[PDB]
Amino acid sequence: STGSATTTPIDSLDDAYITPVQIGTPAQTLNLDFDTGSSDLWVFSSETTASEVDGQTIYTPSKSTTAKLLSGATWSISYGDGSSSSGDVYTDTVSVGGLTVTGQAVESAKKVSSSFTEDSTIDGLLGLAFSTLNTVSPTQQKTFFDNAKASLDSPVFTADLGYHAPGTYNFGFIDTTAYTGSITYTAVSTKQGFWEWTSTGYAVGSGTFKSTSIDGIADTGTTLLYLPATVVSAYWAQVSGAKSSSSVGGYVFPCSATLPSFTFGVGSARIVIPGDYIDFGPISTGSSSCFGGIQSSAGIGINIFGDVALKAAFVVFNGATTPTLGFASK
């Protein structure tokens, strides 16, 4: 089997992407944030504290003939941005882009933190990291991909995120019309539960490529690109007036600037992030200070190849016995 679903930016800045997911019988369609940096599929639901729902589409298990309470199971998750959610668990039928998993753990939110409430466009998250990170207790549950894997034509999914435009998540096949040149594959460590890999270096604009190993995670659920402070300083030093602001919480730059591109290494291959991808607009409405799309990972504890990086590529998440990541230009 295979599946293919369109993923759509939630706003003009590509702060995140939502993908429609069918849950239950009859189908309840929710727009979920596919997150290769976590491993819980959780949704706004009929059980979510009323004051914490503001515009989201909710899953109502009692209206699904295939929903079953996973007795005793609870979940609770906290993300790198400080947001969180928690609740109980049903199993139900979940389909993505024509691909159906029966018996999927659907984690029903009783509580969500303010960040989720305030984002009316995201009805929940669908985790695609490794199932070892799943938070369901006392019986850990599998991700959608993990459950689908054996049935898939090939044990892979691909992320093809758009810049200011829709893209595609495919399951079980590689669309060879969706990228240019070749796909360069690189080793993955699953030791932290993430799609963790080592970039071979970087370049700023038309500058020379610096060979240096940068360990990081491929994370569709993080907006920006988070790299070591040395690397980020080297980038913003090429932008007149750019500075790191503790008050804002990162590098800002004059909105009048033309940003240089950023290149990262995948083995001997190179992925180029156009400068425009790194512009996340005024820090506040009407400001002439703009927020940078490349930020320091110092004090995150890990480097993160978020959407800024991934949307410049066609990315293969290979869930073979020995997992790997593949990157192609597009």
Side-chain angles (χ1 to χ4, degrees), residues 1-62 64-67 69-109 112-141 143-148 150-190 192-242 244-330:
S1 58
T2 60
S4 185
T6 295
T7 193
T8 302
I10 63 165
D11 61 28
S12 61
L13 301 175
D14 297 345
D15 281 317
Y17 300 77
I18 48 172
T19 310
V21 178
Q22 283 66 54
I23 308 173
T25 308
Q28 300 180 41
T29 298
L30 275 64
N31 296 324
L32 302 187
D33 186 351
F34 283 24
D35 180 14
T36 61
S38 72
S39 307
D40 285 52
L41 191 180
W42 75 259
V43 297
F44 279 79
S45 69
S46 61
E47 304 183 321
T48 311
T49 298
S51 63
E52 299 184 343
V53 186
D54 183 14
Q56 296 80 11
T57 293
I58 58 163
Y59 170 59
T60 304
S62 67
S64 176
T65 58
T66 42
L69 180 72
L70 186 62
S71 188
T74 60
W75 64 281
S76 175
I77 190 161
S78 315
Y79 300 101
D81 70 349
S83 69
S84 65
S85 56
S86 64
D88 48 25
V89 186
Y90 295 78
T91 56
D92 209 338
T93 305
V94 173
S95 305
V96 175
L99 171 66
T100 301
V101 169
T102 55
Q104 177 63 45
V106 176
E107 295 169 41
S108 171
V112 305
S113 61
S114 61
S115 169
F116 288 114
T117 301
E118 293 164 354
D119 188 356
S120 72
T121 72
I122 295 176
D123 302 326
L125 262 66
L126 189 153
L128 295 164
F130 292 92
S131 292
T132 53
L133 292 178
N134 175 263
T135 75
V136 177
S137 167
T139 307
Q140 187 167 65
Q141 300 294 305
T143 70
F144 175 82
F145 177 52
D146 216 327
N147 280 325
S151 302
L152 296 176
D153 288 0
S154 184
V156 302
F157 67 91
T158 65
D160 180 12
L161 301 177
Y163 168 69
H164 293 352
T168 306
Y169 280 104
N170 291 329
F171 293 83
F173 73 105
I174 288 156
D175 179 357
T176 58
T177 70
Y179 59 88
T180 64
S182 324
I183 305 178
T184 297
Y185 288 90
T186 193
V188 164
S189 173
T190 62
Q192 285 190 100
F194 303 115
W195 294 92
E196 190 169 4
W197 64 289
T198 301
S199 170
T200 49
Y202 70 100
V204 178
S206 59
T208 57
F209 184 88
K210 173 87 180 169
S211 300
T212 182
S213 292
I214 302 163
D215 180 295
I217 64 163
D219 186 358
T220 59
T222 294
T223 311
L224 307 186
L225 170 56
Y226 294 88
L227 294 169
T230 46
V231 179
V232 178
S233 184
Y235 177 81
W236 288 110
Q238 297 305 307
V239 180
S240 188
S244 178
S245 167
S246 44
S247 56
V248 177
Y251 279 90
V252 299
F253 68 92
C255 292
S256 60
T258 299
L259 296 175
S261 62
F262 184 91
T263 301
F264 63 95
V266 184
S268 58
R270 307 289 178 250
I271 300 292
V272 183
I273 306 172
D276 290 338
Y277 290 26
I278 301 162
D279 173 19
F280 278 75
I283 60 178
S284 291
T285 308
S287 179
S288 68
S289 177
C290 272
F291 197 67
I294 296 173
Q295 297 293 345
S296 171
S297 63
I300 289 181
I302 193 156
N303 300 303
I304 307 176
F305 294 89
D307 299 335
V308 165
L310 302 182
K311 75 175 84 172
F314 176 87
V315 187
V316 179
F317 298 75
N318 173 25
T321 305
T322 293
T324 67
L325 278 170
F327 291 85
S329 297
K330 61 191 194 187

